[PDB]
């Protein structure tokens, strides 16, 4: 039945709406993974809609487009798998399979490197400390002071590693502060 | 019947995937409108899925959940309308109806104030200039230099107007640069 498939899609839409209204600004790592888990399954459920329209077609024009669009999503899904596994070879990090970007941000906080997805990987990376909590490029990494800021962070993408040097860190309003991460060398493979 | 709705959702996900993959990093203002246009219509189509399941009430357990779940997405859609029209009263700008946040960021660039949605509105706002192009909080605003950075930006939300002050601008690698906006006063409405 399509009625039960209608309810599944309604919960898929409802899940994101909750993630878009109540958990958008929130950057909890478990919550962020759940958002990435949802965005990953957005590719099979895009393919499932077109496969259902391809098999249970209305007209050959409608079914023919759904066959082409299922290949279009299928090609875009394999392009994610190709780019992520190529990224996974360089980094050996489980964040390489995030479905939003193929670039990783490595911040050495609390000793262990805190790898996070990075969207743009620009020349300058912004580090903001708020109430003693560091957030770099919209990733709430955790507790970190101005004096405890990582003196060097790296950004890893496919066939290129970008090392970033801490620039000028300015402390504002006590616990809060700001920092500058200008790229200084490129570790291209 | 009920198969054409499958094709509509398939293109809704296909548009979602393209915006989330191909044009995720791209910050063209017309494209950013399209992303906000798509996220706005995600509320009627979440309600449309649950109304369709509520109308097709073959079993009371599935239909009864869909009736209650359509109320949950129905109420939080009107919660968006209530929150945005309150924001529209204070700001009188068409960006108040963005479906991602109820907080607006006003950056005075090129004379006319550039108003953009702001997800966080924290104490410190980072302004990254890359290749002579300013991007504040992930919103690419346009051509700007370190010497041409706005000395004061404001962040307008409901019942609060937070004025931000240019802390210190650092120039890196020539055209690029970096500066921070620390809040210095609040215009409590």
């Amino acid at each position: 039945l399509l009625e039960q498939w209608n309810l599944v899609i309604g919960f898929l839409f409802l899940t994101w709406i909750c993630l878009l209204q109540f958990a958008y600004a929130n950057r909890n790592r478990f919550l962020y993974i759940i958002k990435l888990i949802f965005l990953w399954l957005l590719w099979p459920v895009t393919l499932a809609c077109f496969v259902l329209a391809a098999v249970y077609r209305i007209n050959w024009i409608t079914g023919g487009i759904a066959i082409a669009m299922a290949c279009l999503v299928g090609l875009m899904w394999l392009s994610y798998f190709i780019a992520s596994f190529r990224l996974f070879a360089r980094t050996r990090s489980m964040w390489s399979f995030n479905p939003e970007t193929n670039i990783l941000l490595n911040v050495p906080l609390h000793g262990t490197i805190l790898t996070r997805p990075l969207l743009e990987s620009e020349l300058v990376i912004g580090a903001v400390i708020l109430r003693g909590h560091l957030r770099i490029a919209g990733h709430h990494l955790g507790r970190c002071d101005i004096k405890d800021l990582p003196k060097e962070i790296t950004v890893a993408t496919s066939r290129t590693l970008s090392y970033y040097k801490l620039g000028a860190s300015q402390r504002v309003a006590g616990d809060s502060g700001f920092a500058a991460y200008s790229r200084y060398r490129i570790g291209n493979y | 019947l009920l198969e054409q709705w499958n094709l509509v959702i398939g293109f809704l996900f296909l548009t979602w995937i393209c915006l989330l993959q191909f044009a995720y990093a791209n910050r063209n203002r017309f494209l950013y409108i399209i992303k906000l246009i798509f996220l706005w219509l995600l509320w009627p189509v979440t309600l449309a899925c649950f109304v369709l399941a509520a109308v097709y009430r073959i079993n009371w357990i599935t239909g009864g959940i869909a009736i209650a779940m359509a109320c949950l997405v129905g109420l939080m859609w009107l919660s968006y309308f209530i929150a945005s029209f309150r924001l529209f009263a204070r700001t009188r700008s068409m960006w108040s109806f963005n479906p991602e946040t109820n907080i607006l960021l006003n950056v005075p660039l090129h004379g006319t104030i550039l108003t953009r949605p702001l997800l966080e509105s924290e104490l410190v706002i980072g302004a990254v200039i890359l290749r002579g192009h300013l991007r504040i909080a992930g919103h690419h605003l346009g051509r700007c230099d370190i010497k041409d950075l706005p000395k004061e930006i404001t962040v307008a939300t409901s019942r609060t107007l937070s004025y931000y002050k240019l802390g210190a601008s650092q120039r890196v690698a020539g055209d690029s640069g970096f500066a921070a906006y620390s809040r210095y006063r609040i215009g409590n409405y």
Partner: antibody, heavy 113, light 112 residues
Framework: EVQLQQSGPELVKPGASMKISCKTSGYSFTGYTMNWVKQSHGKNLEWIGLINPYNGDTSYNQKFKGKATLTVDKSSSTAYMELLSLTSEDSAVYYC??????WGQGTLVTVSA | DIVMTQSPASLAVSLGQRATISCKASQSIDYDGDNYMNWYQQKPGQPPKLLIYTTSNLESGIPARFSGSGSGTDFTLNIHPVEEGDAATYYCQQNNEDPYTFGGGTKLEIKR
């Protein structure tokens, strides 16, 4: 702040391997990549390679592949460079830096019999 | 492999003047429209001290008299005003492609 302490000078017979310890302090050892730079004849700065002490992947110079092997010791926060088959061309001062800003004092390696 | 050539081999300027140090890369190091040039200072008996990274950005704690210019292949280190403690050797390193080759280095001499 960030201090990198290296081993002292050692007179090494030709053809004998030598491991150069670069003890680090003032920061989380695994945090930042550890570069190695050779300064031959007191002027010719040459880049040997870098090792990421968190995971252990290295990136050598083409000339120093098979000559130097970079290793780390997370327990003692000490990064090692093990030079292989030392010759008279290896009589140099070897530095270990972090972000090119904080450097070790240099290990003057004298390869003579 | 990128070859860095520094001119002059030795530089001799007096105090308070401007010292111009060149560094001509064999190949263009423009990555994403930006050059990653590192300028070091090495007094005798001491490890090199990073002055300028990414061709213009001055290192923290370095006095604001070392300026890096140029893009593409020509790169310039300018010291103004020159003080007594600037008598050292200045190296340029391309931080773009493996290996990060250093320059030949020039021994700055104070004219007294």
């Amino acid at each position: 702040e960030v201090q990198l302490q290296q081993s002292g000078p050692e007179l090494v017979k030709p053809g004998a391997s030598m491991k150069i310890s670069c003890k680090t302090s003032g920061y989380s050892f695994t945090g930042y990549t550890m570069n190695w730079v050779k300064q031959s004849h007191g002027k010719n700065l040459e880049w040997i390679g870098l090792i990421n002490p968190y995971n252990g992947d290295t990136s050598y110079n083409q000339k120093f592949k098979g000559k130097a092997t970079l290793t780390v010791d997370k327990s003692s926060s000490t990064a090692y460079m093990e030079l292989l088959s030392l010759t008279s061309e290896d009589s140099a001062v070897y530095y270990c830096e972090v972000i090119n800003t904080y450097w070790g004092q240099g290990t003057l390696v004298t390869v003579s019999a | 492999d990128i070859v860095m050539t520094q001119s002059p081999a030795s530089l001799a300027v007096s105090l308070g003047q401007r010292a111009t140090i060149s560094c001509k890369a064999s190949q263009s190091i423009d990555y994403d429209g930006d050059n990653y040039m590192n300028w070091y200072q090495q007094k005798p008996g001491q490890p090199p001290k990073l002055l300028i990274y990414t061709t213009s950005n001055l290192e923290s704690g370095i006095p604001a008299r070392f300026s890096g210019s140029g893009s593409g292949t020509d790169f310039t280190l300018n010291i103004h005003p020159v003080e007594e403690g600037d008598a050292a050797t200045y190296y340029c390193q391309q931080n773009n492609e493996d290996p990060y080759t250093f320059g030949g280095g020039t021994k700055l001499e104070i004219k007294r």
